[PDB]
């Protein structure tokens, strides 16, 4: 019998000739690989609990290609749908782990590369915005930005990309993949940019949703037959705040929740 090293599943997406259908198909496939056999609470799938999750089920891979015919593979943690690192050619790069258990988990990613690197910084938006020199509100998203971001990640091993541009490229990828997988609303925002072949920065309603995912997951899972103990404040597109008191309002907005 032959013994093979273990593999994590790969989902493909290309910006080359991307359409509303190809992007929607990609996000649906990512969600499907995140939620196999998952628990569902108030119609919303819950991602696996990090505690007790076997290492051979901890990650999924997103292989991104572009019109330049380059390929980079991002690793997503299935417990929060977030990017933990990427591979380009014969090199892999990882955000600084938050703890020693997560540091051990990432050693199982990209076990065919000859060069492995860990950034001293983590991958949260605050830090990446600092390195990029721009907030999310001033970084345009769309197929154009993603096309360029894939090239920038690829060329980081060759010296053609410096860290600020790399951080900007992560901000683009994370929002167009991780946040779109988490939120039907952000999926639609990205699909509309593709539909019109335009790029534009995310408005305050998108940013606040991103910042609120953990708290929304908590409120839903702690609710009393769908009613929140305390209302959650979100933002409209014009920046004004509004309150949400019930899971039923979040059902069209959210697609996945972190385990609580």
């Amino acid at each position, epitope marked *: 019998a032959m013994i093979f090293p273990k593999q994590y599943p790969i989902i493909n997406f290309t910006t080359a000739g991307a359409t509303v259908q190809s992007y*929607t198909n990609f996000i649906r496939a990512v969600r499907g690989r995140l939620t196999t056999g998952a628990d569902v609470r108030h119609e919303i799938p819950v991602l696996p609990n990090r505690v007790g999750l076997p290492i051979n089920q901890r990650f999924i891979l997103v292989e991104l290609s572009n019109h330049a015919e380059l390929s980079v593979t991002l690793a997503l943690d299935v417990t929060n749908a977030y990017v933990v690192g990427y591979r380009a050619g014969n090199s892999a790069y990882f955000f600084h782990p938050d703890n020693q258990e997560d540091a051990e988990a990432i050693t199982h990613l990209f076990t065919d590369v000859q060069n492995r690197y860990t950034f001293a910084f983590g991958g949260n938006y605050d830090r990446l915005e600092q390195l990029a020199g721009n907030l999310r509100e001033n970084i345009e998203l769309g197929n154009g930005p993603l096309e360029e971001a894939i090239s920038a990640l690829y060329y980081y091993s060759t010296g053609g990309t410096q860290l600020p541009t790399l951080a900007r490229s992560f901000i683009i990828c994370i929002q167009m993949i991780s946040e779109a997988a988490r939120f*039907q*609303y952000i*999926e*639609g925002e990205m*699909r*509309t940019r593709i539909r019109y072949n335009r790029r534009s920065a995310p408005d305050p309603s998108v940013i606040t949703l991103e910042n609120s995912w953990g708290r929304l997951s908590t409120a839903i899972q702690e609710s009393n037959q769908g009613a929140f103990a305390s209302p959650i404040q979100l933002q409209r597109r014009n920046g004004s705040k*509004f309150s949400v008191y019930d899971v039923s309002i979040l059902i*069209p*907005i959210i697609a996945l929740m972190v385990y609580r």
Partner: nanobody
Amino acid sequence: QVQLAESGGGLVQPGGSLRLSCVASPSLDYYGIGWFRQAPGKEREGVSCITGSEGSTYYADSVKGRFTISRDNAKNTVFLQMDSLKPEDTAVYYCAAADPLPLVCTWGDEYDYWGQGTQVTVSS
């Protein structure tokens, strides 16, 4: 772009049923769809909504249980099944399209495309 056209309205007695259709041309194209209604001299009000790729639904309290919204991508149609109709349901019903739906999907001002409406009348 997208163009929307409603059909399926009519006159029914209390307890009757109607199935409204919101047909998108050339294609529904993963747009979310919201249904609204307006009676003479009253404000428009959102009734129900459905998202474009997961078919997640929302209903105003006044129509929960009685009304069911569903999406048929193959027919490029979103349906609103209206059961146990009441006189108070009399109105012109409109469908509207947005991608994504507004965060509160009864916010009609944020939708981008509207149909011309279909009349629903329930006898007293």
